[PDB]
């Protein structure tokens, strides 16, 4: 269950790396909101899902 | 650290210095246009 | 073109901050 936390946490950190790298680039490109929009939507959704999964699994960690 | 979050003890000790780098990021961002 | 002066100054600033951080690290517990 510890590894089930840690793989999700590494995934959360790497998704956060992807956000901090790409999302300012997508925002500051003059047509980036037109081009990369569903990618940003799926990235934010995946980020929220990882946060809630880690939060639920910390209850089951005993 | 209380529990199985223990192997993140390296990257915890990088966190509070991160808010200072926004000032330097703004200076580099305004140097990118050569201050204009 | 060339490598721009802002990108030169950023790397000079990082190579200064690293040496000053090593100076504090040698200030704390070294001699």
């Amino acid at each position: 269950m510890t590894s089930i936390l840690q793989v999700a946490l590494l995934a959360l950190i790497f998704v956060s790396f992807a956000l901090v790298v790409g999302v300012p680039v997508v925002f500051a490109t003059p047509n980036g909101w037109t081009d990369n929009k569903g990618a940003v939507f799926s990235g934010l959704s995946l980020w929220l899902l990882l946060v809630f999964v880690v939060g639920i699994l910390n209850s089951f960690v005993v | 650290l209380p529990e199985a979050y223990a192997p993140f003890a390296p990257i915890v000790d990088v966190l509070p210095v991160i808010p200072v780098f926004f000032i330097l990021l703004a200076f580099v961002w305004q140097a990118a246009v050569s201050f204009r | 073109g060339r490598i721009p002066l802002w990108l030169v100054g950023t790397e000079e600033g990082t190579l200064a901050i690293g040496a000053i951080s090593c100076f504090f690290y040698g200030f704390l517990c070294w001699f």
Binding site: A28 | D13, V14, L25, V28 | -
Partner: peptide, 30 residues
């Protein structure tokens, strides 16, 4: 141990200005 924290700090620092590098290269309004 310092050997992992230094590499992690180099990654966290180099996440910063490479945003400006990519936006100055690809044609952003920096």
């Amino acid at each position: 141990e310092l050997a992992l924290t230094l590499v992690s700090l180099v990654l966290v620092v180099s996440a910063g200005p490479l945003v400006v590098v990519l936006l100055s290269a690809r044609g952003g309004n920096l």
